[PDB]
Nucleic acid binder design. Structure first.
Ligand SMILES: Cc1cn([C@H]2C[C@H](O)[C@@H](COP(=O)(O)OP(=O)(O)OP(=O)(O)O)O2)c(=O)[nH]c1=O
Ligand SMILES: [Ca+2]
Ligand SMILES: [Ca+2]
Ligand SMILES: [Ca+2]
Ligand SMILES: [Ca+2]
Ligand SMILES: [Ca+2]
Ligand SMILES: [Cl-]
Length: 901
DNA sequence: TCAAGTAAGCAGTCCGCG
DNA sequence: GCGGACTGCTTAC
């Protein structure tokens, strides 16, 4: 077995390392690590160490780590560059693990825990920790067991033991429906007092010390609460037993306004799952309560109880404990699905960083690039301080608001990383500058050729062509991984569509799902077998196919975020390789590439239609073009096509055989023009959109930049069983618009694109007729709530007070004096509802914490005073009017014109 | 809302616009 | 009432 680190810390002049040894065993060592740093020396000195620019460097070996830090300081006082890895943990891992790390996840202790704390006087502040901890469920990945620590006696109630048999049975039997598949995995431990529970929990922690510590909100609540509670009862030294090296810190953590407190446990890698979810899931939720996310991800029903959570333990301790266990399992289930822990470890070990540093792309890329350079004996530069400066980004084309019947989109593969590689954009590859012409001149190939020797970007930057920079070299490796996993993702997606087709025809039999790998396109034998399968087996296969696709999406999209992170990090002042010359070289080249290809695609299509000046490209954002295919369809049919799938094949054949070769010729020319290192602008067909053949649908529409809808039949080679709506930027896509409204707007769009104007007018009429029956939560807007206490002034809306903030102040006033009423937490999401004039709340809106029912006292009143009229015109009618106006449609008839008869 | 980047939309406040 | 300066929030890349 090859060895791998678990955790690494610097504590004074010692590196503290937990690792897995050659025998598969967890181990700990304290290494008195002697770091090296570098200084420029004259050429006279024969050395093997060179900076990234090829300047000679002398290596400086320090007695300890504090000596290395003092030298960096004194080099600053002198005014000279101190080169090398100043994060000595990273240098240590580089020296100790001088190879590609193969890790074994089965040897890494991943702990998933949740605590319960009964609080009769509001939220229990983790930094006070004044209330007893009365439940801890702690799952261990190695044991595969849920360890339940249950307080039977508290100042808030003496309770009976939790019954495992009641927990197992249905809600309909008096039970808690704790999943069968985990019942045998529960190790249950009741305690007579909190001191006993906490002492036992600390002994347990010692024996099964987390490497990865996760859960929901554990970093902001669970961890600091357990730490401070133990600290209040036993002292600081006992609290510090949560760290394997007995060292903890705070932390702080900004931003403005104001600041939080977390506990840094040295030798643990805390990956709060809420944080993993926000970084990697690529959703924006109305609520981040576990229950909301569990419903969203797993389609599991909200685990319900009577009364408030502060009375739950004394009124129903059985359910209290059972829900603590289910809370932990929920997070494991979301991970089984999303695989964010797996992803974190992959990226973390790849980069050779503390695993928790996957949260910082700057940290991740600094470690990768350092390790790539160290391998060649090259020395990294000192990080400098830079003033934050704005710089330009992508080009977005203004669309003409309209409907568009037949649409084909084309999209550049990993654009920004592909520009890095093509141009050879890197800190050490800068060759100089050239006199820049207006961008428009490069777009039209009218400017003089920038260089005959170097590789250029239209921002004026020239780059070496003899060898690849460290940025191109390393961005390529992660790009190639991204491409691998995207393949598995798209194949899984395609395999899912074959199952959906076969679901049109079971096959009334008792059989089993096929043992297949969904990452690969189903063979003809698997296809045959699928066509003989029951609905039960086919649905189970769909679930599994869709799970593979999710797994592929996680792996692919976050490797993409990482590489896009690097292009972005070039424009972040805290990045070691921060250069605005390079950041702009990427974005300017991208602007040219899009507008260059727009010109070429128009020219091509104008040529192959016999026209001049006609604009076939109707829109583009950053790296995408949207081509109007009406004239291509018109040249053939629609006479003339058997079905929808027939013109979708014709357009797929035309895009792949005629257009892409022309796009590639267009891009090969631009590469020569810029004299780039290698041609890497690959623009594949993305979507084929249009109305169902023979229908009165409009196919798609644009309202403006970054706001559009299309009816897609084929996406990147996935031919759908049913057409899919691709809606971008419109209100159906915003977390802020109500659930019921998003749904309603979506069906309006669907009818517009697939069925026509009259189908739209009948749905709108029906929705307007029934919308007052909708549940208040389903029709409440959502906003994030920043700067509440600023507005307020005091406590009414102050000058320029935002609408949602006003609603919160209304809420604050209606719940004034209540300890147990839910407080609106600053920086979180709220539900917002408009209020009718003359209401007892004395303002036009009320807001409350999202993902929650509003307090029983006031609920009846807001429900009574809810302004449905304002609600409808604001969230539904205004947006819908914007759609139909853009699409040249009416949601209301209109005319009409006969009229009676 | 600690944690790579810019572009650009819409809601609402405030206030002009004879 | 609408739009523009401005803040707040949110999304497309
Ligand atoms: C999504 C996204 C894009 N971008 C920039 C960089 C991208 O190259 C460019 C286009 O974005 P995308 O079209 O979303 O993705 P991509 O071209 O990088 O890769 P692919 O299409 O194969 O999925 O916009 C970011 O800087 N950050 C982001 O989060
Ligand atoms: Ca792209
Ligand atoms: Ca693509
Ligand atoms: Ca069949
Ligand atoms: Ca794109
Ligand atoms: Ca070339
Ligand atoms: Cl790819």
């Amino acid at each position: 077995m090859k060895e791998f680190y678990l955790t690494v810390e610097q504590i004074g002049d010692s590196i503290f390392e937990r690792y897995i040894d050659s025998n598969g065993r967890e181990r700990t060592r304290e290494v008195e690590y002697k770091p090296s740093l570098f200084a420029h020396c004259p050429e006279s000195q024969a050395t093997k160490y060179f900076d990234i620019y090829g300047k000679p460097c002398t290596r400086k070996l320090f007695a300890n780590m504090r000596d290395a830090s003092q030298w960096i300081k004194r080099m600053e006082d002198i005014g000279l560059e101190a080169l090398g890895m100043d994060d000595f943990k990273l240098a240590y891992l580089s020296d100790t693990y001088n190879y590609e790390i193969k890790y074994d996840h089965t040897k890494i202790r991943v702990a998933n825990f949740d605590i319960e704390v009964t609080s009769p006087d509001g939220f229990p502040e983790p930094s006070q920790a004044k209330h007893p901890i009365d439940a801890i469920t702690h799952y261990d990945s190695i044991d595969d067991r849920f360890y339940v620590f249950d307080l039977l006696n508290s100042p808030y109630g003496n309770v009976e033991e939790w019954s495992i048999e009641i927990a197992a049975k249905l809600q309909e039997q008096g039970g808690d429906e704790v999943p069968s598949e985990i019942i045998d995995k529960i190790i249950y431990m009741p305690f007579d007092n909190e001191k006993e529970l906490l002492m036992e929990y600390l002994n347990f922690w010692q024996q099964k010390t987390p490497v990865i510590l996760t859960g929901w909100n554990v970093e902001s609540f669970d961890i600091p609460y357990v730490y401070n509670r133990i600290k209040n009862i036993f002292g600081e030294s006992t609290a510090k037993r949560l760290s394997p090296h007995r060292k903890t810190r705070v932390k702080v953590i900004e931003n403005m306004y104001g600041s939080r407190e977390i506990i840094t446990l040295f030798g643990i890698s805390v990956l709060d799952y809420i944080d993993l979810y926000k970084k990697f899931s690529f959703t924006n939720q109305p609520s981040y309560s576990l229950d909301y996310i569990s419903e969203f991800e797993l389609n599991v029903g909200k685990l319900k109880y009577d009364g408030p959570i502060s009375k739950l333990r004394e009124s129903n301790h059985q359910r209290y404990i059972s829900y603590n266990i289910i809370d932990v399992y929920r997070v494991l289930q979301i991970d089984a699905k999303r695989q964010f822990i797996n992803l974190s470890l992959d990226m973390g070990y790849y980069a050779k960083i503390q695993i928790q540093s996957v949260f910082s792309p700057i940290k991740t890329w600094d470690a990768i690039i350092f390790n790539s350079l160290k391998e060649q004996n090259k020395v990294i530069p000192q990080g400098r301080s830079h003033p934050v400066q704005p710089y330009p980004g992508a080009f977005v084309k203004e669309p003409i608001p309209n409907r568009y019947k037949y649409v084909m989109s084309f999209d550049l593969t990993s654009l920004y990383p592909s520009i890095i590689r093509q141009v050879n954009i890197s800190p050490e590859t800068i060759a100089g500058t050239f006199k820049v012409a207006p961008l428009h001149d490069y777009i039209n190939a009218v400017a003089e050729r920038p260089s005959d020797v170097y590789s250029c970007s239209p921002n004026g930057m020239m780059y070496y062509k003899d060898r690849d920079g460290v940025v191109p070299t390393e961005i390529t490796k992660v790009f190639n991984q991204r491409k691998e996993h995207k393949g598995y993702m798209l194949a899984a997606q395609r395999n899912g569509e074959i199952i959906k087709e076969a679901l049109h025809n079971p096959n009334l039999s008792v059989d089993e799902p096929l043992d297949v790998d969904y990452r690969f396109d189903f063979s003809d034998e698997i296809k045959e077998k699928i066509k003989k399968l029951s609905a039960k087996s086919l649905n189970e296969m769909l679930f599994r196919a869709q799970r593979t696709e999710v797994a592929g999406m996680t792996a692919q999209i976050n490797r993409k975020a990482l590489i896009n992170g690097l292009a972005g990090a070039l424009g972040n002042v805290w990045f070691r390789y921060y250069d605005l010359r390079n950041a702009t070289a990427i974005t300017t080249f991208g602007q040219m590439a899009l507008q260059w290809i727009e010109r070429k695609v128009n020219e091509y299509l104008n040529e192959v239609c016999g026209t001049e000046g006609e604009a076939f490209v109707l829109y583009g954002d950053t790296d995408s073009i949207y081509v109007s295919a009406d004239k291509i369809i018109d040249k053939v049919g629609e006479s003339k096509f058997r079905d929808t799938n027939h013109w979708v094949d014709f357009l797929d054949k035309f895009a792949r055989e005629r257009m892409e070769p022309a796009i590639d010729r267009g891009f090969r020319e631009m590469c020569e023009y810029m004299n780039n290192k290698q041609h890497l602008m690959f623009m594949d067909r993305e979507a084929i959109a249009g109305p169902p053949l023979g229908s009165k649908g409009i196919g798609g529409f644009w309202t403006g930049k970054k706001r559009y809808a299309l009816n897609v039949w084929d996406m990147e080679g996935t031919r759908y069983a049913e057409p899919k709506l691709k809606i971008m930027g419109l209100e159906t896509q915003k977390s802020s618009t109500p659930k019921a409204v998003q749904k309603a707007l979506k069906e309006c769009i669907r009818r517009m694109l697939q069925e026509g104007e009259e189908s739209l007018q009948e749905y709108f009429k029906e929705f307007e007729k029934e919308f007052r029956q909708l549940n208040y939560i389903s029709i409440a807007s959502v906003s994030s709530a920043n700067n509440i206490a600023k507005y307020d002034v005091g406590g009414f809306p102050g000058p320029k007070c935002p609408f949602h903030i006003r609603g919160i102040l209304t809420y604050n006033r209606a719940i004034k004096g209540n300890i147990d009423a839910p407080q609106v937490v600053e920086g979180e999401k709220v539900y917002v509802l408009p209020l009718r004039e003359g209401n007892p709340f004395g303002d036009k809106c009320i807001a409350w914490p999202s993902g929650t029912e509003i307090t029983d006292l006031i609920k009846d009143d807001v429900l009574h005073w809810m302004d449905y009229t304002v609600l409808l015109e604001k969230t539904f009618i205004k947006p819908l009017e914007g759609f139909t106006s853009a699409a040249k449609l009416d949601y209301e008839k209109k005319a009409s014109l006969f009229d009676m008869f």
